[PDB]
Amino acid sequence: KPHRYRPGTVALREIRRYQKSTELLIRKLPFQRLVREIAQDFKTDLRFQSSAVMALQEASEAYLVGLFEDTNLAAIHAKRVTIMPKDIQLARRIRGE
Amino acid sequence: KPHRYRPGTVALREIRRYQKSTELLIRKLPFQRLVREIAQDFKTDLRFQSSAVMALQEASEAYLVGLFEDTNLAAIHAKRVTIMPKDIQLARRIRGE
Amino acid sequence: ARAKAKTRSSRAGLQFPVGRVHRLLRKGNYSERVGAGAPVYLAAVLEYLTAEILELAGNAARDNKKTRIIPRHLQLAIRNDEELNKLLGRVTIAQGGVLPNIQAVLLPK
Amino acid sequence: ARAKAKTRSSRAGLQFPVGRVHRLLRKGNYSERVGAGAPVYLAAVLEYLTAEILELAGNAARDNKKTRIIPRHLQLAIRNDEELNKLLGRVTIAQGGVLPNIQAVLLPK
Amino acid sequence: ARAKAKTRSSRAGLQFPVGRVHRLLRKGNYSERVGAGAPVYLAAVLEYLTAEILELAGNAARDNKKTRIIPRHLQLAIRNDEELNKLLGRVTIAQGGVLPNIQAVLLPK
Amino acid sequence: KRSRKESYSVYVYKVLKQVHPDTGISSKAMGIMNSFVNDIFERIAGEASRLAHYNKRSTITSREIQTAVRLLLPGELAKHAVSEGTKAVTKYTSA
Amino acid sequence: KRSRKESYSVYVYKVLKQVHPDTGISSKAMGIMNSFVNDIFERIAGEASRLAHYNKRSTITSREIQTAVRLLLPGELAKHAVSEGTKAVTKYTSA
Amino acid sequence: KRSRKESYSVYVYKVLKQVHPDTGISSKAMGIMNSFVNDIFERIAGEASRLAHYNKRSTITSREIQTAVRLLLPGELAKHAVSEGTKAVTKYTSA
Amino acid sequence: KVLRDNIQGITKPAIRRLARRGGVKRISGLIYEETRGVLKVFLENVIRDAVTYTEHAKRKTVTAMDVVYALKRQGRTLYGFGG
Amino acid sequence: KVLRDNIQGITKPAIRRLARRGGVKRISGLIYEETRGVLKVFLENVIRDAVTYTEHAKRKTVTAMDVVYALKRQGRTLYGFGG
Fold first, then answer.
1. Does residue C98 belong to the interface with chain I, where contact is any CB pair within 8 Å?
2. How many domains does chain H have?
3. Measuring CA to CA, which of C46, F53, G75, J28 is 20 to 30 A from G12?
């Protein structure tokens, strides 16, 4: 019989793994694509240092992750383990955004 | 029977009053006493402009009141109407206090 | 023998003091030289912002039938404008109060 | 007839450049005059702070048996001190990762 | 002998010609005498209204992704501002077209 | 050889680049603007003349123009035009 | 004998009478306005200072101030301030 | 070659060998420490400028540097920073 | 002179007033002491800052300018006190 | 030349990875598009400022140092790219 883990066990191992890891979790070139797409909405045909793209990737991942710890706090504060977009809206409203 | 409002009606009326009002919700003299009590612990024989104590006041109700809308958002997130101190703790920690 | 005194605020056609803002920027230590149009531009920006917030406070005072601007009027004017709220999300006002605001679940039925 | 040009960091027994930091303060436009002991005091404070953060980083690298300090070790050091994290809560380290943290309700029975 | 000539539009700091408008009012048979500030006031209010309708036209062109304003943009701008709309309800624009407007029962179902 | 003809193109061009440096203009839109400025100028001038006749005032001042623009321009446009003209006549008075 | 103290009282009161001739003001509201106008003054001034450092310029010009307005003031207030300040700079240029 | 670019590599390397002769350093972590020290430096410089302005002081001296580091740094970090700075100030005072 | 528990000088009905200004409907009994501790932390931080201003000012008396400097140090700017 | 849809380039498994870094055990299906919108908001907020810096620097190439300026403007100072 092919093994199947009970749910969340792999999720917890993922949590341990990616808390242990330091690297970026976003695909680099699609992120560059989206950054340039937002950029042309302000000024077209600009050039980018790849360092600027990596800095934006780091800051974006950090802001997202901190938002997710706040979301996790809200969800467990609501006595749930599944996060919801309303949790994110709550967290952003608490942060003053 | 004598008149008696159901629970929450007086709360609604006083919420409307105090949102409409701007006047201080703290008795001024014990507030000044507490300010002198805390300040003596850091430096002896400290004297106060009364205006300085008042500015310390509206800073106090400002921070506290904003903390209670955060708490109310947590409570309505938590499907409750009665706030509990862990809601305040959640608001402080998500703000990063 | 000498030209008559004429203010630089009038030279911009503005009310906010060009010379005062120039002196404050020079003594506020932001750069060792300053462009001539920079304090004029700054005073124009502050005059515009003051004028628009004074308009909003005037509307707030007229809605509550009061002739004079009140810090309650200022609080209501700033907090009801999402642009100015995002300008001043971290600013507190003395004796300002808050928006009259209730959650719908707090209302009965 | 000049004496030997001695260095003010050695005069204060310090590592950080007194002259460079004094030059930065003179050209960073914070006041037109700078007291002589002020950059010395600043450099000492900075040396103290760098000493503690580098010591914690080396301790963390030793804990991970690593002989060359890592930005992961910098994150682990800066976040596991209460006063340092209170100093630098809003500041992010590139490639720092996150603290190992799982809530107890997330953990299984 | 004579100072350098300064235009009254520059003295007001507004772009519309004060001298041209004053000359027009002198030769337009409206009064035997005109107060000096009256054509200035006229040029100011004209430049305000042209400025605001030019903002509306520029927004319309940018919404239509066009660099240069066209009479269709003028139609769309002038009809969607109610004060301007009833200001020019009886005033017609060359090649302006009409607003996109369909009555409710004209739609199916 | 031609005869010089008046138009308001260049002042509107300065105003346009003041409010939108990035936005161009078509010339027939400028013809519509020329009809606009001439028509509104004529409206205000006729109102000012008739008001000057009503009080038997043989001179039209900025008070009269203010009255006329308050009559024709509605409200929000009226109050902002009043503000702009008041600032303009004030800074001219200082000049 | 008292040393003179600076305030924004005359300017805010005159611009109030410009925007609303019929509207009064309370004095502590004027204190709030003093704090506001001062606060924005150091916000723009500090932004201009650091932007002058970043391009290594020892002179802060109107370009720096306009850039700082685009930074701190979001959306429509920024572009309206740019237009009015450009008008003021142009009128000073004519001055 | 090119123009010189300022860095803090040598001083941080010396301090590292003071606290840990045995261990090494990565260059990206070196960039992190440069960002760290520049950030703290500009912070302390900012509050020094503000405090000197509050007392209307044309000269920035060590006492308000002490005030600012006591203000920012939390608790025992601040007290030991005061101790280290006081020691270095006394030693430089003794040349 | 020496004051001992003026933290309870912030009365429970005053806390109810502050909550109603925040639009809070129902308040637990556990709330008041916890909020007293929270406001205690807030006040001690800001008065530490304001004090440090004051002895740096070589003054014995706290001024409101020191207070508003302390609040703007914390990103909690207050208007209306001569700032 | 133009780009039309790269917000979907931030794929669902990447968001899952970020959430596991965030300590999230369970993720709803409604999360991902809302996080895309939130990310879009944060990125546009920083990059509008970055464009402002770069144009004020009279450059058409975006530099990371301006990204540092923009991030520390919005209270989100990043270590590892200064200079």
1. yes
2. 1
3. G75
